[PDB]
Amino acid sequence: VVNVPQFDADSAYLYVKNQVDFGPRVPNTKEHVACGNYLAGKLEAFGAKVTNQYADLIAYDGTLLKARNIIGSYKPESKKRIALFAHWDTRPWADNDADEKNHHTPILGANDGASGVGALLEIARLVNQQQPELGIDIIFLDAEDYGTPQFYEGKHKEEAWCLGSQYWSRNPHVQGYNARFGILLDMVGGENSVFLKEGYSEEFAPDINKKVWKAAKKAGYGKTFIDERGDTITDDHLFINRLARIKTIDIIPNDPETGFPPTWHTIHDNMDHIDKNTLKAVGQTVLEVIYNEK
Ligand SMILES: c1ccc(Cn2ccnc2)cc1
Ligand SMILES: [Zn+2]
Known part of the structure; x- marks a missing residue:
């Protein structure tokens, strides 16, 4: 019925490593600026129509973040769309480290940051080469991981996290945006x-979780996408x-012992x-989903 492209794991792995090779992508650093330019450039080289959303976002302590959400759009005139998201910034504090002396050191964010973006770059490469029926938006979200440090004494507000997605959600890159x-x-x-069905996902979009986990099973990744509800x-x-x-x-991964990966x-x-x-496993599942949408 539909030939789903094959996700190239070696290609995706290299896009992950390329981000990490900049050093930490902490907002307001030259490494962050360089990586943003790399990601926007890569999407444009893979045939996406790129919209940059530069925003002055205010962090939990009043720090102004020079943020950049990056949107790469395929079949931009289609009104029937699927949005794919990953955060691209990295956390400026290793505040869950086993050793306290590392709690103020920026992480490399290979998994937390680079993995999602690298997977989506490989998806973008393939979507360019053979388009699915629906229009695809690849959305790299900034300033996800500048939320209140664990060591901070004071208010820990939920809204300190995910500043780029909050901004994008209130201010879409195109007026009347739908997916x-x-x-x-x-x-x-x-x-x-392994990846379990996440709690908010189950409450807001159980039909979409069902679609994704069924797709994973159908594509042979049922041992990685476990049909079970995990954490919220x-x-x-x-x-x-x-x-x-x-x-x-x-x-997002769920481990019975650590919750998130131990890193x-x-x-x-x-x-x-x-x-x-x-x-x-993740990338092929996403391809299976987007190419079977009619
Ligand atoms: C608290 C805040 C944010 C999260 C999600 N998250 C994802 C990557 N880094 C953090 C989980 C707990
Ligand atoms: Zn994080």
């Missing part, structure tokens, strides 16, 4: 990771669902713990 549904990729490269996670999709009202699910918000979130086979 049938959305998929957010968050930490999709970790060795041995504050992530970009919460704000997208609440503010933009696009039914959006989160593909999460530690100085160990680097390429040593990225497995291209995890990228493959």
Whole structure:
């Protein structure tokens, strides 16, 4: 019926490594600016129509973040669309590290940041080469991970997180923007990771979770996409669902012992713990979903 393209895991892995090779993508650093230029340029080289959303976002403590959401659009005139999201900034503090002396050191964010973006770059390459029926938007969200440090004494507000998705959700890149549904990729490269149906995703978009997990099973990734409800996670999709009202699910790992991968918000979130086979399982599932939408 439909020939779904084959996600190239080696290609995706290299897009992950290329981001990490800039160093930490902390908002307001030259490394962040350079990586943003790399990502926008790559989308444009893969035939996307690129819209940049530069915004002055205010962090939990009053810090102004020079943020840039990057949107790459395929079949831009189609009104029938699927939105694919990943955050591209990295966290400026390894505030979950086992050693306190690292709690003020920026992470490399290989899994938390680079993995989702790298997977979506590989999807963008393939969408260009053979388009699905629906228009696809690849949306790289800034300033997701500048939320209140664990060491901070004071108010820990939910809205300190996901500043780029909040901005995008209130201020779409094109007036009247609609999508049938959305998929957010968050930490999709970790060795041995499995993905359960996330709680907010189940509450806002259970039909989309069903679609995605059925697609994974059908494509042979049923051992990676486990048909079971996991944790409820504050992530970009919460704000997208609440503010933009696009039914959006989160593909995010769940481990029974650590919840998130053990590298999460530690100085160990680097390429040593990225497995291209995890990228493959997630990326191929996303392809299976978008190419079977009519
Ligand atoms: C608290 C805040 C945010 C999250 C989600 N998240 C995803 C990547 N880094 C953090 C989980 C708990
Ligand atoms: Zn994070």
